[PDB]
């Protein structure tokens, strides 16, 4: 429902949605290939379905293709930092399509 | 220490990683097990 919403907000006004009391199929997320980038460091995607945490905050916004390349760890540039920041430290899958 | 006899860059040493899920003690394992770990495509040149 979140992804198929007609209008997303602008990149500066990043909607913060709290996620709780719902079942998330991370494994289906990984196996599904419509999602263009499912980069992962923290936890193995097969075990992801098994592993469960208490609090999840999800961020939604829209950017250019070049800025999708630019919003990557260990990289320096204009959009990556200036208006909506992703900290180096967080444990959280980055999903782009 | 190995700085005297090695560390020239020295890349000779190879350590095996995801090929085996687990492994019994005190066996030497040389099996190539071409591309295994976990996936839907198999047995080729895979990314």
């Amino acid at each position: 429902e979140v992804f198929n919403a007609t209008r997303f907000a602008s990149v500066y006004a990043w909607n913060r949605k709290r996620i709780s009391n719902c079942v998330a199929d991370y494994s289906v997320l990984y196996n599904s290939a419509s999602f263009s980038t499912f980069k992962c460091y923290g936890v193995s995607p097969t075990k992801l379905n098994d592993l469960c945490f208490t609090n999840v905050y999800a961020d939604s916004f829209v950017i250019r293709g070049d800025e999708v390349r630019q919003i990557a760890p260990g990289q320096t540039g204009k959009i990556a930092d200036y208006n909506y920041k992703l900290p180096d430290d967080f444990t959280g899958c980055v999903i782009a399509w | 220490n190995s700085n005297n006899l090695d560390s020239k860059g020295n890349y000779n040493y190879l350590y095996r990683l995801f090929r085996k899920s687990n492994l019994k003690p005190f066996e030497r394992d040389i099996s190539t097990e071409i591309y295994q770990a976990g996936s839907t495509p198999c047995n080729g040149v895979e990314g």
Partner: antibody
Amino acid sequence: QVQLVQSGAEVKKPGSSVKVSCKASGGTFSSYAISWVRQAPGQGLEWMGRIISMFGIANNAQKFQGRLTITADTSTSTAYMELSSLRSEDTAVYYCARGPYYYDSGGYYLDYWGQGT
Amino acid sequence: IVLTQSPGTLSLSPGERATLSCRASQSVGSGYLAWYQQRPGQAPRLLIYGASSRATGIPDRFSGSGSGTDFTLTISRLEPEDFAVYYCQQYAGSPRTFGQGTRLEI
């Protein structure tokens, strides 16, 4: 620095065997995942094989599987190809390939190519 | 897999901001595609690797982008020496596969 010498052009009767060299001079050979390629006149280039020099094991491309044997001679720092059951359509210029595929290091595809056969 | 490029040949005079796209039929990974540049009567030369992972040793004017089913190689500032033939290359699973080629003319 790195180069693979091309031979004098060859013509073979169908069904014969052709040996194509691939010289490596300079750099640290036997570390890179050596591969193989060719390009037909007026057609794009096509991949044939991959040879891991350390364990001397190779795999063959589907379209050419069962016809190409690839080995790497570490002593002479060379890469060898053996092609059998040659036919009329198989004639084309053949190239050699290298570039490093390491493990979780990325950069699977890279140049380090030569000039031809 | 078929690597659909834009277009087979683009007849453009020098300096355009040229998106030399490549569209694989099935998703090939967003760090998993590569472009090669063949000089006239020569052997191709790698310019961009891993879809967006800028190849070392290369000036910024050539830059690959895209993800999913549509991928793009961008030329930001076309120069006289940039006219050449460019080939994309599947980098995910399966054998290395090359596009039918894009020849860049003046």
